[PDB]
Symmetry: C2
Subunit: 407 residues, 2 copies
């Protein structure tokens, strides 16, 4: 197709784009750009909106980007020195399918009013991808990246991004990633959050809030995060092969489980300071007849192959128990987990019903039922305690995370 070198969102609007067209935004700092990337491409010929030189096309002031259409690719942009007046910084519309944003950044794009809500990235539509991006420094109301649910699963892919430091919001709505809302929580989303770094994401209790079904949070790093990866609403979610490395940092929590048929496996939950709701593996108590926005009993959780090391509290069965939250976790199993150099191996706030605890290993002098002394050889490679027969280089050591043009 054609290559169009532009220096304004107006020029992009006065353009008719066909598959294979590439729009190149001139390098520089462009203020108050309302970009509407509205076009349609194909798998073999997508329409591309790329920066002249990666990381050198800045959108300052009140600049926004809307991605509207099929097979669209946005590449190399940086939103800094500004804020949005009302809309989300980056938006994929409901009719936007098979589109992607890559090598892009949103840095300190904060509203002067800390209570003024907007998200930095909103995902809608189907099979859209956010990759090799950088979202750092959100100080105002609103989750950084939202996956907005619909009647059909989205199969969105959020991968290889760097979610930088997010200061404590003080109130709810400060998550890094929220997948769904309580109304859409009984719907399947099928979102994949994979190979991302969540560095110092302290916005609120939940770094990731899963509020829909069949999502997968796989092989990510949660580095020194004041929060937890929570299974808030919904069923059939998976939290696997992740590294939650709090580095002894205050209130660094693990994985919080609420709802049914969840799989928590292969995670490294090390150097965590949290307890109760922020335990390395927190299994919550729930209400009898809950509305969507409330708490659903933990039924059939499958917690296997997790290595908890150097932490305050490893497992908390029945966390959050009170007058309304009396229902204990039921069914499922807690098998083949390791709990080393952890002050509390297992806490029980509510006796579980039929939760099978067996073949777990700990270095604790006192073995709680279902735990034995450590029999497998362990190794501390790349700062992480791993099984000597399953030692691997963590993804961030051998892959580029965040923009390609950055370091």
């Amino acid at each position: 197709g054609n290559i169009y070198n532009i220096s304004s969102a107006n020029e992009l609007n006065a353009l008719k784009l066909q598959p294979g067209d590439k729009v190149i935004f001139k390098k520089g700092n462009w203020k108050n750009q309302q970009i509407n990337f509205k076009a349609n491409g194909t798998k073999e010929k997508p329409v591309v909106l790329a920066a002249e030189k990666g990381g050198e096309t800045i959108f300052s002031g009140n600049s926004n980007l809307k991605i509207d259409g099929n097979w669209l690719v946005v590449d190399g942009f940086v939103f800094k020195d500004g804020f949005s007046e009302k809309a989300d910084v980056i938006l994929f519309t409901k009719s936007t399918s098979n589109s992607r944003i890559t090598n892009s950044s949103i840095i300190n794009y904060n509203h002067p009013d800390k209570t003024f809500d907007y998200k930095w990235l909103s995902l809608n539509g189907e099979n859209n991808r956010v990759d090799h991006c950088d979202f750092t420094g959100k100080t105002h109301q609103g989750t950084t990246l939202v996956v907005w649910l619909d009647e059909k699963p989205n199969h969105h892919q959020i991968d290889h991004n760097y979610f930088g430091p997010r200061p404590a919001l003080g109130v709810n709505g400060g998550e890094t990633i929220r997948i769904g809302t309580s109304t859409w929580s009984m719907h399947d989303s099928y979102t994949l959050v994979e190979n991302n770094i969540f560095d110092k994401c302290d916005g609120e209790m939940e770094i990731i809030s899963l509020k829909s079904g069949h999502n997968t949070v796989n092989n990510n790093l949660f580095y020194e995060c004041d929060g937890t990866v929570t299974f808030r609403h919904g069923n059939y979610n998976t939290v696997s092969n992740n590294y939650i490395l709090g580095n002894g940092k205050k209130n660094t929590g693990g994985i919080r489980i609420i709802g049914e048929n969840h799989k928590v496996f292969g995670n490294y939950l090390q150097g965590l300071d949290g307890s109760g709701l922020r335990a390395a593996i927190s299994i919550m108590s729930a209400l009898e007849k809950p509305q969507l926005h409330e708490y659903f009993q933990v039924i059939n959780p499958q917690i296997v192959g997790n290595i908890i090391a150097d932490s305050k509290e490893g497992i908390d069965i029945g966390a959050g128990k009170n007058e309304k939250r009396m229902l204990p976790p039921k069914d499922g199993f807690l098998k083949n987990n390791y709990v080393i150099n952890t002050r509390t191996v297992i806490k029980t706030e509510n006796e579980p019903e039929g939760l099978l605890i067996e073949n777990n290993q700990t270095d604790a002098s006192s073995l709680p039922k279902g735990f034995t002394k450590v029999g497998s050889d362990l190794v501390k490679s790349d700062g992480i305690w791993q099984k000597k027969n399953d030692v691997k280089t963590p993804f961030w050591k051998k892959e580029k995370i965040g923009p390609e043009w950055n370091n």
Copy 2:
């Protein structure tokens, strides 16, 4: 305020409008107009986008309107001789409040593909108004006018519009008005549909589909409509003072009740050819533990003062009963209703539980339980049987329905 005189959507894009401005789109037929009416007005000084003369600014080809802002008024435009390529023809964004569309039309604006889905008017946000508009001739997939539910009630108002002929679509998605989806059915909408005419809206089973709560379908005319006003999902909805005049036309139905705490009162249900689900008042059976998209047991239905005349079937109690749908209507009352010159006055498919049926007058020789012999309380005025003391001029006989610039007649 400022008065702008444009002839293109490109001119509108370059205009920086403030509370009190009025943009006047020049008389003519303009094709492929992508109208983005983005502005913020006030209650005292609104921002109007008006046609030079109502009905004389035509948007043909692939034209679309987006109403994105506060206190905005769109007035006098016609969408015809074209179709939407992807988007709904007229849209109120989720960021829109206190905005209005009046004296406007969408006429046979059909995509060449009958299965291609887009709505003609889409409502989002809150306190928005669609009035004095003409929506006629939808042949392709999709509900004509949609109220899209959100987390807070909308309080939208749909009034004095003319919804003209809609051919049968043959599948779901052929409603005239859908207020919500089963996902949002337990949410309050607070939408009002009042003083509109639904003329020959044969799109599908439901002329109007209520899939949310606290809605009011009041004082409308459904003339020769192949379908029903269905309380599909949601509770506390009201269907009152409507004229459902089938005029003997094949499968013309009435009001279909599903769910809880609904009110059905003062309706004239006459010349209906429908039975079972399409009876004048059809009170459905339901599943024991249903999902939000299925059928919820009819609880506390309050059916009073309905004048059912010249129909195939008056009331069907337990309509749609099957092996799954066994829960019958419970509680509430069916009282002060009139059923005259009707083949089956009241049919009972599933025996109701605790349903009060008293003071219902009819002319059928064998009086059913809770029915008394009708006297001379009713009179046939304007071709509509009415209670003598309550005789009135129908709203459509004395009000402009549809655009002010159009001399419409059924």
